[PDB]
Amino acid sequence: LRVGNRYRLGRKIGSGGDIYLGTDIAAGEEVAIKLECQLHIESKIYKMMQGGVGIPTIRWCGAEGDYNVMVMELLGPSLEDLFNFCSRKFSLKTVLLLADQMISRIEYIHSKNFIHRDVKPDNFLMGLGKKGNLVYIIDFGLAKKYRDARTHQHIPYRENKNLTGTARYASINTHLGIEQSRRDDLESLGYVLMYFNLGSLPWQGLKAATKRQKYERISEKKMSTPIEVLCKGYPSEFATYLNFCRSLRFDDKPDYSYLRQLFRNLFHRQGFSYDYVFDWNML
């Protein structure tokens, strides 16, 4: 069960390669271990992202027996696990506390010349203990460089591309086959926030013969659902957010500060406090 002299491999607990529990024997601390029979590609991204708020720390990376191994600090449940535990209903306060942090995580990945390309509830995990108020972002398996690290030359505009994320949260431009850029991670976040508000999305649970037929039905439903209808009965900020994302040009640097201020002004109008008391903390 030995991993890089100081780690002990525990039980399999999920998938992202498979995810196992483990122990840093020397420090007396539980860890998360990702085993691969892409791990190296992804480890380089995590390494570049190190030091960022809500970026998980990679303790060790190497190879053991038949596997490539990555050791990460242990984090808490995903927003999808917490949403299901909360009966698929989050108060407006929880959605807004989450939106503030999620915009910041996305901005940080973009500042490091990458786009995530798979913004969904399963890829945001709450921290544990003293970091329990922190939203972490994970899984750089589908991530891609959008600009040169030195020159900041944006990748060219490309058409006729495959869907490289989850269909439910994909941007309209992703359904059209356009190369993903910064605007696309933010538009996906906009659908995640509306999903937390509604408990479901209108293009969710569409029946079809093939998965490619289902994506074409999701595309059609998204393109025929006005933002004002999708967001009806919820504060206007959710619609304003999605409209701003949809207006972004391919190589535009999004105004992240404006997007955070949109939700922060609504948060203050509602009289909420930034005490990081989420719905699940009340249970």
Ligand SMILES: Cn1cc(-c2ccnc([C@H]3COCCN3)c2)c(-c2ccc(F)cc2)n1
């Ligand atoms: C889908 N996914 C989840 C995790 C993950 C990361 C940290 N802590 C956990 C906790 C969450 O609470 C329950 C116990 N495991 C899971 C991972 C991962 C990613 C990279 C890595 F090197 C290790 C793990 N992927």
